[PDB]
Nucleic acid binder design. Structure first.
Ligand SMILES: [Zn+2]
Lengths: 60, 121, 193, 85, 43
RNA sequence: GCCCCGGCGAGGCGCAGGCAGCCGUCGAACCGGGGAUGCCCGAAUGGGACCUCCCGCGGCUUGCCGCACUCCCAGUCGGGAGGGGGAACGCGGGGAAUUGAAACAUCUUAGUACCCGCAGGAAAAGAAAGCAAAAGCGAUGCCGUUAGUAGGGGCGACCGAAAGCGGCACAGGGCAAACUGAACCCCGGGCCGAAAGGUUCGGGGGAUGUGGUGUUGUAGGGCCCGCGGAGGAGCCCUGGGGGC
RNA sequence: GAGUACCGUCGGUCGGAUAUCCGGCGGGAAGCUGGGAGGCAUCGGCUCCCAACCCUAAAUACGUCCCGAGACCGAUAGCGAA
């Protein structure tokens, strides 16, 4: 999940991926109350990447 | 009724003054502006002077009546600056004009001179 | 022409047609606000010597101030007898300068150039003030006045840079007697004026 | 508020479990700035259900808590199981 | 050399300044006219 | 904590010596540079604040833009400005008492502490209606002397300069008026051109004077009358070199 | 280049003393054959200047920051705060 791949795609796919990632994050934070404690961090930063690059595109 | 106004002037004589100004603009010579009119009266190249009645402040034209009485030159009044400037051929008003070398306007000039002389006296 | 005659009419208003004009004008002015904008100057030659052009960016204002001096408030703590006085004090700024500062308070985007006296009553004096808009291109394009769009020229009237402030600071003198006024009053421990 | 940006967490406590079993209700920790209509749309869109009632409170930890009742056609147990619980 | 200094006004825009007298201009035409009329006697 | 261009060259995940795990050879962490995101209050500004939270009106398409006060240019379309903050230094106003005089009232403390207003990276000043004295100098500012001197003062306690001389550093320019009389300035659009510039189409100003000229001591300038030419000086960077 | 220069009176300030500067009040010019200064006021000479409009770099003052240094202190010391 890197800009190399992200910048190869279109905008609709990016928004869809953001959506599914946010749902994943909510579910993982739900279970965290009750392995691999870095899933949340990596999800957050993937979301940030996607938004940054989508904005680069929609600005140019 | 500002105080530099020394006598009343009928609409007829005012119209005649404006028409003389327009005719002499076309053909003869015209000095537009209070500074130029004052220079003309001080030198002695002016036949008829036209003042406006709606000038504020008064300090701008209040010297012309006495200066013209001294230099024995005739002057008349008109009620608006916009019309005076429009007949002088300008896109701006004018508080005073002087006609010089009237061409095809001597008729009106002489008539206005006599009328305004008997009006002052 | 047309300026010498105004000068001569205004050099003494009692000996001219100006006294009566002024009495009537003041009857009306007494009814107007303390700071009022006007369309044209009253003393055109006076305006044109101090700096005034028929251009966009020049504003003329008339200001009314009360005559006389000042009265100090009543000291509440104890004072020695040389520090008790209340009634016989005079301002160190001139009424002209005070009037310019009033106009500047009312017009917060302009700068004062100069001012001139235009009338006197038993209770009131009148001054006309020339202002300039330093953000207008017609002004930025005129070298006679383009300096005023600099960074060290805002607050002129408040720091003392108009002719009235120069005069009340004491900078029209030179040589014997002017030892304590330059380069500033603060530079000499306030001992000038 | 925009959907997918409203819900922070599901809640699984003894009280929430009792409610899922006895009243067809889910319980969520939600953003402070979201309203009942936004919460309704969020739950609907993110889980493809129909919502009958939303109740809200602010806790003494600064988090907004929402009790969402589902219509009887649906079953909150399936949504809870499909979630991490 | 009478090369201009470039300064900025109250706003963000740029003015030309003479290095011999301190005058301030907005246009090269005016700067040139001034530099030639006021200091041409320097040859 | 997200992205990109360069550097360095294998480890990295703050003060902070832990557990479980992730990122990195597609060149990370780190360093220089440039971008994105940037909740509420606050000059706080669509309107209200006994609680950093609330309540709206228009226009478009649920998401977005506009909607404060005092003004300028305009004009019922729009385009602009100001407010607040900043250690010390800066400019302009208002202004005590302790204390000393072995008491104290003129005086001193002191144009001091404090108060109000206004600016900047420096501010203020600045180009003789001057200083001098049988000789002359040549804007302003700063340093060393002049000097505890001239002089002020219950002539008490105390207060207190300047010119000149030696140095640092150097620079001079523009208006108003007289004479001309629209030959003028800005704003927006379109054409040429790398830019500077040029050329057009409208609108706003201006005869209550835009523009040109001119700026000084027995003077300078204008007006009037004659001779005349080649040398000056700036703005911009398609391009080519060089140094930081 | 006019309520200006100047005259008188009051208040403040100054080393400025009958000869400092600012302000208020009452009077108030000439304006190129013109005007001002030269430490009480006036007269005559001699010398020096041309106010009442505007702008201006460098040499200076400071250090909330940065760089460098020290016959400075060495944890009750040194900035209140290692
Ligand atoms: Zn110059």
């Amino acid at each position: 999940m890197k800009p190399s791949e992200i910048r190869e795609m279109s905008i609709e796919e990016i928004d869809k991926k953001i959506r599914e990632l946010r749902l994943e994050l909510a579910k993982e934070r739900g279970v965290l109350t009750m392995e691999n404690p870095m899933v949340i961090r990596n999800l957050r930063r993937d979301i940030a990447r996607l938004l940054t690059i989508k904005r680069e595109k929609l600005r140019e | 009724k500002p105080s530099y106004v020394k006598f009343e002037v009928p609409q007829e004589l005012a119209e005649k003054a404006l028409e003389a100004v327009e005719i002499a603009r076309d053909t003869g010579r015209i000095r537009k502006g209070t500074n130029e009119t004052t220079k003309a009266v001080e030198r002695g190249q002016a036949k008829l002077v036209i003042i406006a009645e709606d000038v504020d402040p008064e300090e701008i034209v209040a010297h012309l009546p006495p200066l013209c009485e001294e230099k024995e030159i005739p002057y008349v009044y008109v009620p608006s600056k916009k019309e005076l400037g429009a007949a002088a051929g300008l896109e701006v008003p004018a508080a005073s004009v002087a006609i010089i070398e009237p061409g095809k306007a001597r008729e009106l000039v002489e008539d206005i001179a006599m009328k305004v002389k008997e009006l002052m006296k | 022409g047309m300026y010498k005659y105004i000068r001569e009419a205004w050099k003494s208003p009692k000996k001219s047609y100006v006294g009566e004009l002024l009495k009537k004008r003041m009857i009306q002015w007494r009814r107007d606000p303390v700071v009022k904008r006007i369309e044209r100057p009253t003393r055109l030659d006076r305006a044109r010597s101090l700096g005034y052009q028929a251009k966009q960016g020049y504003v003329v204002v008339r200001v009314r101030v009360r005559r006389g001096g000042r009265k100090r408030p009543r000291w509440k703590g104890g004072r020695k007898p040389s520090k008790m006085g209340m009634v016989k004090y005079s301002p160190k700024k001139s009424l002209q300068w005070i009037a310019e500062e009033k106009a500047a308070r009312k017009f917060p985007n302009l700068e004062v150039l100069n001012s001139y006296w235009v009338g006197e009553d038993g209770m009131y004096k009148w001054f006309e003030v020339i202002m300039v808009d330093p953000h207008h291109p017609v002004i930025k394009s005129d070298p006679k006045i383009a300096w005023i769009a600099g960074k060290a020229h805002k607050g002129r009237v408040f720091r003392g840079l108009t002719s009235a402030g120069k005069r009340s600071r004491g900078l029209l003198n030179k040589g014997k007697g002017a030892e304590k006024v330059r380069p500033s009053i603060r530079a000499h421990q306030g001992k000038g004026k | 508020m925009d959907p997918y940006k409203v819900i922070i967490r599901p809640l699984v406590t003894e009280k929430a479990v009792s409610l899922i079993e006895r009243e067809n209700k889910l319980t969520f920790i939600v953003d402070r700035r979201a309203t009942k209509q936004d919460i309704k749309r969020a739950v609907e869109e993110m889980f493809n259900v129909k919502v009958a009632k939303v109740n809200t409170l602010v806790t003494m930890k600064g988090e907004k808590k929402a009790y969402v009742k589902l219509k009887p056609e649906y079953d909150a147990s399936e949504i809870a199981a499909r979630l991490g619980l | 050399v009478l090369k201009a200094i470039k300064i900025e006004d109250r706003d963000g825009e740029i003015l030309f300044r003479c290095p011999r007298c301190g005058m301030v201009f907005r246009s090269a035409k005016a700067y040139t006219r001034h530099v030639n009329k006021a200091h041409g006697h320097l040859f």
